[PDB]
């Protein structure tokens, strides 16, 4: 009943619980009001749980977006801080536009940033895109790489089919059964 993490977040504690339940140890989410959450495991299951905290880098950091480092409420807005705030909202809207396809659970899109072509007389370079995806199993995951490339091809000015890269995979096996209490 020795505690190991406290003051967590609502989105963090469900990830620490979902990782520990995969490795046959149970955890308990104890609310504390103003301070936060806490996670307590049993006494013989403390040695294994510290090793999976160290391995999985828990707790997870909050996810970083490029528009967070040039805030709109700041008193400065350079043209670099506008071309980097527009591109950071397009690759978030494309990722939310990718979760509504047939059989996709998660996706992540990266745009290549060019910022100083408009300052100088040289023309801008071509645009490169890259995307990851996680599909539900039972899907023939060799054939869905052309529907995403057709969707991403003309959502920009002029990209080719060789400057887009989609790397997708199927999800892991489901964890449906309960872990179990250590009999002592």
């Amino acid at each position: 009943d020795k505690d190991l993490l406290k003051g967590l977040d609502q989105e963090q504690a469900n990830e620490v619980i979902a990782v520990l339940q995969m490795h046959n140890i149970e955890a308990n989410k104890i609310d504390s009001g103003k301070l936060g959450y806490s996670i307590t495991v049993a006494e013989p299951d403390f040695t294994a749980a510290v090793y999976w905290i160290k391995t999985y880098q828990l707790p997870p950091r909050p996810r970083v977006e490029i528009a967070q480092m040039f805030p709109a409420d700041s008193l400065v807005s350079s043209p670099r801080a506008e071309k980097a705030r527009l591109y950071s909202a397009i690759e978030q809207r494309l990722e939310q536009s990718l979760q509504t396809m047939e059989g996709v659970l998660s996706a992540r899109v990266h745009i290549s940033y060019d910022i100083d072509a408009g300052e100088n007389g040289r023309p801008p370079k071509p645009v490169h895109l890259s995307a990851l995806a996680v599909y539900e199993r039972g899907s023939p995951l060799a054939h869905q790489i052309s529907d995403i490339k057709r969707f991403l091809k003309n959502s920009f000015a002029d990209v080719d089919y060789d400057n887009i890269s989609v790397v997708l995979s199927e999800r892991s096996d489901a964890q449906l059964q309960a872990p179990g209490t250590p009999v002592k």
Binding site: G138, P140, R150, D162
Partner: protein
């Protein structure tokens, strides 16, 4: 409590089969009803032993077993339209098994599936499986490129296809893999950037000559 009452309201999307090894198998149809019937058997509201089977995954479990005890076998697919009596679609022109050892193969396949009663082995032809795949690929008006070789056919679909040709090719490959399975014939739909969809020519002194199919493609200025 019986097993067929612990499932959903409609008793038509599941089918309970009694097992020979004192078990009880539930035959779902797709992955959504498989996870529906596995949450029941995983939360633990049942006393005896039971299992969940599926057409897509128990053909893969039986093909992992088949390629360590019977290598160099030519077959296509196991069909489960009657789950108490499956049909094995064996090839004809690529195997040399007699009748007395087709009996041994049917007796060893029966012991792997304790829910079945008799596995029926039939010999489908190897030419009609590829002729149906080409007669259906010409009817949808699709550009393609056939590459015949020994022990396998492959169709390559290259080029800058539009949306209708992509949706028709994806609906034809998905409607063909369910019937035959990708053991003998394989499709290679990919998207490059050239307005000539796969085909290429060279020009000298007489007109045009059709080049041989290769991996390099000419990028299209247009």
């Amino acid at each position: 409590a019986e097993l067929d009452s612990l499932l959903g309201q409609e008793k038509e999307r599941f089918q309970v089969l009694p097992g020979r090894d004192k078990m009880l198998y539930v035959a779902a149809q797709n992955e959504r009803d498989t996870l529906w019937a596995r949450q029941v058997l995983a939360r633990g509201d049942y006393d005896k032993n039971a299992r969940v089977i599926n057409e897509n995954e128990e053909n893969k479990r039986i093909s992992i077993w088949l390629d360590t005890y019977y290598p160099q076998l030519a077959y296509y697919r196991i069909h489960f339209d009657e789950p108490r009596k499956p049909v094995f679609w064996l090839s004809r022109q690529r195997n040399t098994m007699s009748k007395k050892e087709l009996e041994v193969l049917s007796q060893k396949l029966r012991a792997l599936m304790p829910y079945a009663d008799s596995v029926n082995i039939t010999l489908m032809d190897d030419v009609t499986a590829a002729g149906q795949a080409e007669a259906g690929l010409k009817q949808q008006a699709l550009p393609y490129s056939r590459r015949n070789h020994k022990g396998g056919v492959t169709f390559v679909i290259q080029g800058a296809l539009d949306d209708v040709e992509i949706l028709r090719a994806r609906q034809f490959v998905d409607s063909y893999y369910r019937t035959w399975g990708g053991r003998y014939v394989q499709f290679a739909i990919e998207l490059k950037d050239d307005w000539l969809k796969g085909r290429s020519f060279q020009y000298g002194a007489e007109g045009y000559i059709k080049m041989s199919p290769g991996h390099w493609y000419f990028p299209s200025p247009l």
